[PDB]
Amino acid sequence: GVGISTGTFNNQTEFKFLENGWVYITANSSRLVHLNMPESENYRRVVVNNLDKTAVNGNMALDDTHAEIVTPWSLVDANAWGVWFNPGDWQLIVNTMSELHLVSFEQEIFNVVLKTVSESATQPPTKVYNNDLTASLMVALDSNNTMPFTPAAMRSETLGFYPWKPTIPTPWRYYFQWDRTLIPSHTGTSGTPTNIYHGTDPDDVQFYTIENSVPVHLLRTGDEFATGTFFFDCKPCRLTHTWQTNRALGLPPFLNSLPQSEGGTNFGYIGVQQDKRRGVTQMGNTNYITEATIMRPAEVGYSAPYYSFEASTQGPFKTPIAAGRGGAQTDENQAADGDPRYAFGRQHGQKTTTTGETPERFTYIAHQDTGRYPEGDWIQNINFNLPVTDDNVLLPTDPIGGKTGINYTNIFNTYGPLTALNNVPPVYPNGQIWDKEFDTDLKPRLHVNAPFVCQNNCPGQLFVKVAPNLTNQYDPDASANMSRIVTYSDFWWKGKLVFKAKLRASHTWNPIQQMSINVDNQFNYVPSNIGGMKIVYEKSQLAPRKLY
Amino acid sequence: GVGISTGTFNNQTEFKFLENGWVYITANSSRLVHLNMPESENYRRVVVNNLDKTAVNGNMALDDTHAEIVTPWSLVDANAWGVWFNPGDWQLIVNTMSELHLVSFEQEIFNVVLKTVSESATQPPTKVYNNDLTASLMVALDSNNTMPFTPAAMRSETLGFYPWKPTIPTPWRYYFQWDRTLIPSHTGTSGTPTNIYHGTDPDDVQFYTIENSVPVHLLRTGDEFATGTFFFDCKPCRLTHTWQTNRALGLPPFLNSLPQSEGGTNFGYIGVQQDKRRGVTQMGNTNYITEATIMRPAEVGYSAPYYSFEASTQGPFKTPIAAGRGGAQTDENQAADGDPRYAFGRQHGQKTTTTGETPERFTYIAHQDTGRYPEGDWIQNINFNLPVTDDNVLLPTDPIGGKTGINYTNIFNTYGPLTALNNVPPVYPNGQIWDKEFDTDLKPRLHVNAPFVCQNNCPGQLFVKVAPNLTNQYDPDASANMSRIVTYSDFWWKGKLVFKAKLRASHTWNPIQQMSINVDNQFNYVPSNIGGMKIVYEKSQLAPRKLY
Amino acid sequence: KAKLRASHTWNPIQQMSINVDNQFNYVPSNIGGMKIVYEKSQLAPRKLY
């Protein structure tokens, strides 16, 4: 009713330990959510076409052209790690657990409050806020997944990461099919390469509305809404990283001479002439057995074209790759392709007391070693006569198509039946948690945005909207926009996300890497003297595991 | 109560498939409804008499004279296809179903909100809107059908067709008996033809009031009202059209010579002299057997006087006809009589962002071929001596009564015991769905406004009205109008309309006509960049069926 | 064994239809000539993601 609360605030994280070294992790998250009435009550079909940017030759990667349906609804999205875990919980999980299973997800809305704004227009302007006891909040749960899946973490538009900071939902919109052609060019390209927005293909038209597809609940101040528990069916997520490349698989060569003194100058030696060695190689016309040429069971990782842009009906898009560059761990400047870069605002980790629209950014450098170092690649002739002469070798410094800045590694692909790789690591706090699986006949082996992929279904998207609060002068047959009482809503959101994790064991004599507070990062985890908070990113696959 | 919702919004359409190829179609429709208090609380008896228009000789078809009772009540009418189906649902129904049965209808009112308007009269005028927690909405359901039946679709005044667009009811009024004489004239008629409103016949007086005939429910903000389910008893509606005229019934003549090469010049020939043929004709004094003269089982369609205006006690009215003109399908300009013309506003399909009072209009051209082409008719003498001479034939170009613009087809009637015809097709979105049957001893074989006709009864009309909100200065013995607090109501309406449809079968080698989105009509089914919507009309009897 | 399609969107979808242009692809000629022109099979869209 008017004066009775309809729910409870809970933002605790409970670790319930089982037998056999498993733990149930139930993350409770609660937020005060602020929602204004939509700018307009109508669905819009809006085309964006930044021709000015792409009209500059060589700027085709800056294409923003697209068509989207703008809806009056707002999306409540909790699909991001920072929503559910503070840094202490994350430290516990990543330091003490070896794998993580996504179990269930629940959410509810309670203590709904709706208010109207009255502006007096007095010479000193002033306004007052009145409770609208009979106004309603419209809530729709797309449990059948009829609406397009639009996870907000990819735009950094989920619920905020601070329990004591009120947050907002994000205005909902989804892609509307369009055709677009963009011929690539470079600086010094003569003329205007074709840069055209062709319109919409009628056979691909899909205009979705919430009202026609989803039951809509009207919540007054005394009402509440609960989704019920959803249970996931995803694969487990490892909290360890592999380090073994092809060079560290299997039995090392026997060393016939071992160092007799310590130091960095005292190496061992195999002690057998390279073409007089025993073992197996896939090179049937050579006698050289070396660490480079010896047969390995399969290939860890794969090379892919990097900063390749493929074009389809909707225009160019970057070719995604499964794993980040090799050597980025030793030199952060070499992260580049496959190392996800996250940009986010003050709701999601940026120091809350900073000013300006510039976001906080970081590039995630995963601990796993499944990537490539293209400067170390080469192709050489089948004859394999060593030392290889210039004409019999293709080096990463050899131009392709006459371009000094492009080599064969830029267009190289070694993905095959022997390729082995890992799933993407969780990115705390900004990374997405779960993602819907594509509805294609043949599905990708993984996603690059979330560790957990929903095979059959995962929870319906939650949509909210302030119900129209008409004045006395409404006229439906009038073309002009509806005249509404300025109305906004504050409601409380509570979610429960349950995981199942396995406690790690100590397999080696040595200790392993562990997340730790220290003198340098100390003040990333406590408020400033004026209450400024931040959440810096954390790694998740600290402990190694043996690949083979 | 004040802070508790009393219902749920639902605008989904569910198709539940049965055994034997039948489907239950349940259309859920929900609307926010805006209602101001009535202009006056009194019933009025108002006479309209546009003498200025009809005083012009030859304008008698423009007569608007009538008497009506103007009531303080408002009618909530959902009897129109656009209220229940969006274009996608309609496409599914008309492309995949062969017949449609009207099953049941339910409706309810919930989340009632009543507000008052306070105008400050400050030098910059301003107003504020307060909830009247104790005000009431008066709701009356004429389940016994005591009130006159006034379906709003004929005035294009039903609930709107957009779930996300708030709508309004229509002020209720009904006809009050009057006597009126209007002698027809033409331009150049001398003098003033008698054009008189005679008043009211006392034995025909019927003054209905809601309060004396219907229980009235007072709904406060915490109250709701449900009608209960009404079950129809109407005939099924076909979703196929017949094409066979009299000329395509039964066995065609045997062709004794068939074409030996393809092309439009290579016809077949019957190969028997016309007066030497075998078969049956109704022309007992001729030996000519032709496709025109051969006996057919009955007559498909009938000729009727067109733009005939008959006069009765209340003045002239146009003679209705069952089916539209023949040849209108090939040439839209020849639609004319029997092809219903719909005019409607921005609630009911007109582009919502257009401006001006000019309505959107279309003429429905039915696919059925039961009409007539009067320019092809003729009458000739019983002697039937061919080729018929001028004096022995009456042609559509022969003047009647000396008028060059009037021929015998204008006054012709071929309705008889051999006449066969079809029911009117559904008109999406603006067409009426169901209609009440006349209370005459002898009933019409069909209605021209709705495919489904209620034999015994169909649902009671739903009436709403803001209850009087008196100031402190009310004086019943004062002749001046009641002084009321400016009060209006917003309530939510939800209806459930259930159909039963049969899945169509493929009877022929060839495919049939099907409703489809294409490059030309593509943008009729999606919002504009500023949220403008429209609903264009659709046909409903696309697939053919064999008549005989 | 086939599943009946549902209408997921406000708009109608593409549908195979006889029209004035393709009409005579589906009936015999005056000398009995027949043809069978190809047809598409994935007319209705579905959301990938």
Automatic annotation (TrEMBL), chains A, B:
GO biological process, alphabetically ordered: clathrin-dependent endocytosis of virus by host cell; symbiont entry into host cell via permeabilization of host membrane; virion attachment to host cell
**Start and end of every Coat protein VP1/VP2 Parvovirus domain?**
1-517
Q: Cite a GO CC annotation.
A: T=1 icosahedral viral capsid
The species this protein was found in: Canine parvovirus type 2 (CPV-2)
Protein origin, superkingdom: Viruses
| Name the UniProt record assigns to this protein | Capsid protein 2
Q: Which residues cross the membrane?
A: none
Instruction: Name the protein family.
Output: Belongs to the parvoviridae capsid protein family.
What are the recorded GO MF terms, alphabetically? structural molecule activity
Keywords, sorted A to Z: Capsid protein, Clathrin-mediated endocytosis of virus by host, Host-virus interaction, T=1 icosahedral capsid protein, Viral attachment to host cell, Viral penetration into host cytoplasm, Viral penetration via permeabilization of host membrane, Virion, Virus endocytosis by host, Virus entry into host cell
Q: Does the keyword Calcium apply?
A: no
Q: Per UniProt, what is one Pfam family of this protein?
A: VP1_2
Q: Where does this polypeptide localize?
A: Virion
Quick one: where is this thing mainly located?
virion
Keyword GTP-binding appears in the UniProt entry: no
